[PDB]
Symmetry: C3
Amino acid sequence: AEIYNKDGNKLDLFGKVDGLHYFSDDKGSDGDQTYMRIGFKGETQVNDQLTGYGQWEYQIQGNQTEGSNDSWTRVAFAGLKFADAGSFDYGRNYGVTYDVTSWTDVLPEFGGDTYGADNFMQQRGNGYATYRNTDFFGLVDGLDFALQYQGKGDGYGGSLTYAIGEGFSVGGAITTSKATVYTGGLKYDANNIYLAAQYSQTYAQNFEVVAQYQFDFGLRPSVAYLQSKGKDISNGYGASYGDQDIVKYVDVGATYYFNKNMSTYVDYKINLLDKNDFTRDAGINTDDIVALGLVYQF
Amino acid sequence: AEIYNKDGNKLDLFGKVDGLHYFSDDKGSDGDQTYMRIGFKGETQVNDQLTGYGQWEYQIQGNQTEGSNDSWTRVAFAGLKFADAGSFDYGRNYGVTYDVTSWTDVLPEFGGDTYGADNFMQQRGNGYATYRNTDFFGLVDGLDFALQYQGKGDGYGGSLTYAIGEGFSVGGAITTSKATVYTGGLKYDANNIYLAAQYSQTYAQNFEVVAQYQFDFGLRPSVAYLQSKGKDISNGYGASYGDQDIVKYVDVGATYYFNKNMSTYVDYKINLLDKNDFTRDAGINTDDIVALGLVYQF
Amino acid sequence: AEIYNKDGNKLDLFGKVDGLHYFSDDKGSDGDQTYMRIGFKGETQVNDQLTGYGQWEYQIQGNQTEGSNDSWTRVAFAGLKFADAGSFDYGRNYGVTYDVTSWTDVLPEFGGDTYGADNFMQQRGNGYATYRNTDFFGLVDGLDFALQYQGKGDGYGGSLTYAIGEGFSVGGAITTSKATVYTGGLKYDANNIYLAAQYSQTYAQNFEVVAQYQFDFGLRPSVAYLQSKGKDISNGYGASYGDQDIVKYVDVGATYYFNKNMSTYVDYKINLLDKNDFTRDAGINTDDIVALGLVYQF
């Protein structure tokens, strides 16, 4: 919801109350988790050439009872934007590994999650300097790329998207922090068909694919699969764990789209993982789980 | 302040900074409680028939100091409205007992309080799935009902309102969670003349009644009274306390009304409870306490 | 961004994402500190005479990791406004000392800092009942006075600011909670030149001086300094810490405003404190540091 436009300065104030109640035999997941979101994108044209933007967004829960306050800044960054030189912006932002990893997180509820926020660059984090450049300096249309730097431990990364034509995105991203990661994804986008898959290796090799159709009265079914395997492991100081599977599941989900402002969705995580000494001490869940929600957004 | 309305999606954002310096002999109350609430109501017409909504207004303190943070989500939900088919909304929402109980929470400062928030659905809560139906299916003018449902522990209730005509309002509900508390009460609202009473017993009984008149220049005086009395009693694990009053007091008060957007108001709790083996440990305030401040809103 | 004006009720929503990267040899300093702030000014015209305003603005960190939350209400007060009798505003407000003390705090990033927040009335805090009078009952131009009163511990204070024609401003102020504190400052304000020096003494003496010049192509380059020397202090229940310096350093800085919504800045704090018995047992910093951020506001 754009709340202000005047003399080349525009502020969309966006956000939503998403209602949703997880079902499970798991008890760290059964319950109400209606959270909600606020955040604004800001903008200011300085000269025909640049723009000084700014962008924030925080989450805050609703399931937490009174007195208690489960809050946190999702993204919060300021930058600048020059004519066909692209843009730099430093703040709490997305790791530039997300650029490709993104295409697979699209599920109604249970997406990404083979990478985490503050998980050494693959997702969000703090202190990120970010130069991404769009339509390769105005000479190559449909080719984008970003070269990124991190705040503390110290890190770096790069990403290149490419819309090869049609809707076939192709994408790569490399990153390192002091632990590196590659990142390859290919998305199809066109005629209501969304087919995107992505995988990589780390310092430990994970995959994810997802396929949706967009029904016309407004309903986006989704079959999606993702996994992650590894190598040797270490409980804090010691404990030698062999090579097992981290998180692997098939997923059917459907979102219904009333209009922009209001969606409604059921999603069925069909879990695979087997209950063992791994998935006890680490406390990785093994139960297939299912969630319904009524989101209102603005 | 409805900040945006266009293409049948509105979004009133509302709030207030309400300053009040309590006064007391007690040190738990005596001091600055300058607090504030932001939030928004959001709408979206989907059809001739339905509109989706969503609403969130969470609290913050101006009394806590710098670094330390006292906030919590008062409400957060999203639901649908079908025309004459009532309205569903699940989430951090009000309780069904409150429908009826509310008519008594009209004091300048200290009203209701025979129930806290999260106090088993008599007020706010979490997981509160709800369907309310106004004007009874659009066949009876002014007889409205609710049947609600809670998250966990488990539960349910349901209210029936009726503006008998003129300015009267008879009111009733029951509720239950796994503790079952009922509700009876009346209100009268015609000629700046506000009269209202409510009470029920639980599983153990409490009552509240109030009277107000709205002055033409803008001064709504309120004398009001409420009390609670109890049966068998247990201090966490154990105890034998007998039957005593958990809270009973008479109230003078008078809100002044510059306009809608601004208010001043003096309220004087005239407590009756005597200092005893009850009000020492369980820590019930046994002091009469008097509040002074300025509510600015938008 | 004034977001509302209708029937003489205004509402100016502001905020800003100022992503800075602190450099130092410290480990509590060097790193990322993207903070951000929201805040609303409030307005409602009641008569020709009064217009009952209200303000608010809490902070929120963007460096704090996910799940964690670093917030605090900076100001949140409600007040009325009588034209030629002044303005009363009770709430989480600035202390009556800051009227003067302020003129020195204009440095790009670090400044003031001699007084803390909640630092016994010298700046921000809670419970402030405030009556300031502008243009002195409308009969003396170039003058303002204030006599404030705190909540709890108890206290009072006064202030007298006078822009003495041209661009010279004389500032005097006093506060006395039950330890006192005077305050004396001088600002010069005209042709692209700021010159502001101030000091005081508490129950313990401090001083701050700054001179910034406002360029024509944008860029206010700054030079500034401040020092605070005390008497006998004691660690909680003991320790005789002779006579030393809390903090003394010369500062250099430079904001570069692109326009009124975007700024870039560097701030080179040159610190002069030697590390000894004091700085080690009290967490006082011995290092000189560099600050580099990118404010965006609205």
